[PDB]
Design an enzyme around this catalytic site. Structure first.
Site, mmCIF file in Angstrom:
data_model
loop_
_atom_site.group_PDB
_atom_site.id
_atom_site.type_symbol
_atom_site.label_atom_id
_atom_site.label_comp_id
_atom_site.label_asym_id
_atom_site.label_seq_id
_atom_site.Cartn_x
_atom_site.Cartn_y
_atom_site.Cartn_z
ATOM 1 N N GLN A 57 0.662 -1.584 0.312
ATOM 2 C CA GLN A 57 -0.187 -0.381 0.415
ATOM 3 C C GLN A 57 0.904 1.529 0.034
ATOM 4 O O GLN A 57 0.208 2.271 -0.463
ATOM 5 C CB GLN A 57 -0.733 0.045 1.173
ATOM 6 C CG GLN A 57 -0.462 0.078 2.731
ATOM 7 C CD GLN A 57 -1.205 0.324 3.318
ATOM 8 O OE1 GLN A 57 -1.951 -1.375 4.059
ATOM 9 N NE2 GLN A 57 -1.751 1.387 3.769
ATOM 10 N N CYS B 50 -5.480 0.578 2.937
ATOM 11 C CA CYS B 50 -5.031 -1.034 3.837
ATOM 12 C C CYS B 50 -6.754 -1.558 3.388
ATOM 13 O O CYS B 50 -7.144 -2.655 3.073
ATOM 14 C CB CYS B 50 -4.801 -0.961 5.264
ATOM 15 S SG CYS B 50 -5.974 -0.324 6.319
ATOM 16 N N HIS C 36 -6.849 -1.025 11.337
ATOM 17 C CA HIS C 36 -5.886 -1.533 9.821
ATOM 18 C C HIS C 36 -6.399 -2.716 9.921
ATOM 19 O O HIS C 36 -7.410 -3.773 9.753
ATOM 20 C CB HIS C 36 -4.861 -2.505 10.253
ATOM 21 C CG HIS C 36 -3.917 -2.572 9.215
ATOM 22 N ND1 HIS C 36 -3.527 -1.636 8.259
ATOM 23 C CD2 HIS C 36 -2.576 -3.943 9.114
ATOM 24 C CE1 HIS C 36 -2.529 -2.295 7.812
ATOM 25 N NE2 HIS C 36 -2.133 -3.791 7.791
ATOM 26 N N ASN D 167 -1.275 -9.875 4.777
ATOM 27 C CA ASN D 167 -1.059 -8.184 4.863
ATOM 28 C C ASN D 167 -0.713 -7.438 3.301
ATOM 29 O O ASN D 167 -0.797 -8.096 2.809
ATOM 30 C CB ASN D 167 0.198 -7.495 6.151
ATOM 31 C CG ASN D 167 -0.578 -6.331 6.362
ATOM 32 O OD1 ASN D 167 -0.510 -5.409 6.335
ATOM 33 N ND2 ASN D 167 -0.010 -6.225 7.937
HETATM 34 C C1 LIG Z 1 -4.986 1.991 6.552
HETATM 35 N N1 LIG Z 1 -4.306 1.286 5.942
HETATM 36 C C2 LIG Z 1 -5.923 2.466 7.488
HETATM 37 N N2 LIG Z 1 -6.639 1.908 8.386
HETATM 38 C C3 LIG Z 1 -8.447 1.498 8.200
HETATM 39 O O1 LIG Z 1 -8.633 2.516 7.109
HETATM 40 C C4 LIG Z 1 -9.177 1.586 9.125
HETATM 41 C C5 LIG Z 1 -9.615 0.275 8.360
HETATM 42 C C6 LIG Z 1 -10.939 0.055 9.335
HETATM 43 S S1 LIG Z 1 -11.178 -1.347 9.799
HETATM 44 O O2 LIG Z 1 -10.643 -2.647 9.900
HETATM 45 O O3 LIG Z 1 -9.977 -0.948 10.835
HETATM 46 C C7 LIG Z 1 -12.354 -1.368 10.876
HETATM 47 C C8 LIG Z 1 -12.587 -0.426 12.260
HETATM 48 C C9 LIG Z 1 -14.161 -0.756 12.940
HETATM 49 C C10 LIG Z 1 -15.195 -1.052 12.298
HETATM 50 C C11 LIG Z 1 -14.853 -2.386 10.716
HETATM 51 C C12 LIG Z 1 -13.543 -1.821 10.486
HETATM 52 CL CL1 LIG Z 1 -13.828 -2.603 8.952
HETATM 53 C C13 LIG Z 1 -11.860 1.534 8.839
HETATM 54 N N3 LIG Z 1 -9.627 1.865 9.107
HETATM 55 C C14 LIG Z 1 -9.921 2.569 10.516
HETATM 56 O O4 LIG Z 1 -8.600 3.033 11.039
HETATM 57 C C15 LIG Z 1 -10.907 3.607 10.928
HETATM 58 C C16 LIG Z 1 -11.657 4.162 10.271
HETATM 59 C C17 LIG Z 1 -11.417 5.133 9.008
HETATM 60 C C18 LIG Z 1 -11.737 5.108 8.157
HETATM 61 C C19 LIG Z 1 -13.153 5.392 8.546
HETATM 62 C C20 LIG Z 1 -14.231 6.051 6.880
HETATM 63 F F1 LIG Z 1 -14.299 6.868 7.445
HETATM 64 F F2 LIG Z 1 -15.302 5.144 6.858
HETATM 65 F F3 LIG Z 1 -13.946 6.486 6.190
HETATM 66 C C21 LIG Z 1 -13.822 4.678 9.126
HETATM 67 C C22 LIG Z 1 -13.129 3.991 10.111
HETATM 68 C C23 LIG Z 1 -10.628 4.455 12.420
HETATM 69 C C24 LIG Z 1 -11.113 2.996 12.151
HETATM 70 C C25 LIG Z 1 -4.069 3.165 8.647
HETATM 71 C C26 LIG Z 1 -5.993 4.072 7.435
#
Ligand SMILES: *C(=N)C1(NC(=O)[C@@H]2C[C@@H](S(=O)(=O)c3ccccc3Cl)CN2C(=O)C2(c3ccc(C(F)(F)F)cc3)CC2)CC1
Length: 216
Positions: free
Chosen positions: A19, A25, A163, A183
């Site tokens: 990525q 991610c 993540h 990953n």
């Molecule tokens: C990846 N490079 C990185 N992480 C994320 O975008 C992660 C991915 C999901 S999750 O898998 O952690 C998750 C968490 C809670 C419920 C469902 C899921 Cl699938 C979300 N996320 C986050 O870091 C998070 C987040 C970020 C953005 C949004 C958005 F508004 F929709 F855009 C939602 C949630 C804090 C949880 C480091 C960027």
């Protein structure tokens, strides 16, 4: 369920991708799950465009290189009527204008299934469906510098995941069970880009807390 599963052995999994310095991610997790389901459907493993997701799934709630959700990605694919191949819409690791071209669509989905929030349910899904998109707490240096063996972090949260990754199987090596997790940090991280996450140890790192896959 079988005692062990590895979908890489059945041709469901593309090589490990990277990525880079973009918070995408979620897009790699989503393409991984969809690559698996398309392979089950057609017998063709085709690498899918994370860039297409990064650039185009804002309406569904994703935030490009600043994060997003696998389920929002799956919703995009359904709303959009397609998703481009990696080859046609290559990865740039920056958020850009949407350049989706339906001519080069090679995947679709009809929705998604959210798995009950227990490791027993996750195992049943992995056994029967294929690779599964999962949320984990990756916010510990122990994960950043993981090299080999079963990853276990006493401070890991089962509720605060940051993540998105892909479960491609499970198995066993006292506490010897693991999830096999792909990953998106390149092959030089972990075991060829994979991590064996502790399994059946109280939903470690929240791996069963937000698991899902697309229907195709
Ligand atoms: C990846 N490079 C990185 N992480 C994320 O975008 C992660 C991915 C999901 S999750 O898998 O952690 C998750 C968490 C809670 C419920 C469902 C899921 Cl699938 C979300 N996320 C986050 O870091 C998070 C987040 C970020 C953005 C949004 C958005 F508004 F929709 F855009 C939602 C949630 C804090 C949880 C480091 C960027």
């Amino acid at each position: 369920a079988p005692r062990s599963v590895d979908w890489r052995e059945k041709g469901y999994v593309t090589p490990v991708k990277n990525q880079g310095q973009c918070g995408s991610c979620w897009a790699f997790s989503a393409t991984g799950a969809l690559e698996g389901q398309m392979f089950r459907k057609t017998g063709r493993l085709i690498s899918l465009s994370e860039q297409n997701l990064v650039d185009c799934s804002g309406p569904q709630g994703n935030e490009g290189c600043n994060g997003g959700l696998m389920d929002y990605a799956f919703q995009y694919v359904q709303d959009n009527g397609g998703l481009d191949s990696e080859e046609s819409y290559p990865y740039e690791a920056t958020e850009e204008s949407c350049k989706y071209n339906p001519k080069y669509s090679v995947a679709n989905d009809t929705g998604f299934v959210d798995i009950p929030k227990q490791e027993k349910a996750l195992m049943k899904a992995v056994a029967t469906v294929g690779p599964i998109s999962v949320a984990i707490d990756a916010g510990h240096e122990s994960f950043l510098f993981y090299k080999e063996g079963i990853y276990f972090e006493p401070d890991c949260s089962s509720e605060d995941m940051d993540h998105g990754v892909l479960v491609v199987g499970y198995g066993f090596e006292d506490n010897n069970k693991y999830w096999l997790v792909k990953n998106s940090w390149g092959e030089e991280w972990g075991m060829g880009g994979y991590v064996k996450m502790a399994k059946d140890r109280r939903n470690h790192c929240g791996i069963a807390s937000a698991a899902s896959y697309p229907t195709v």
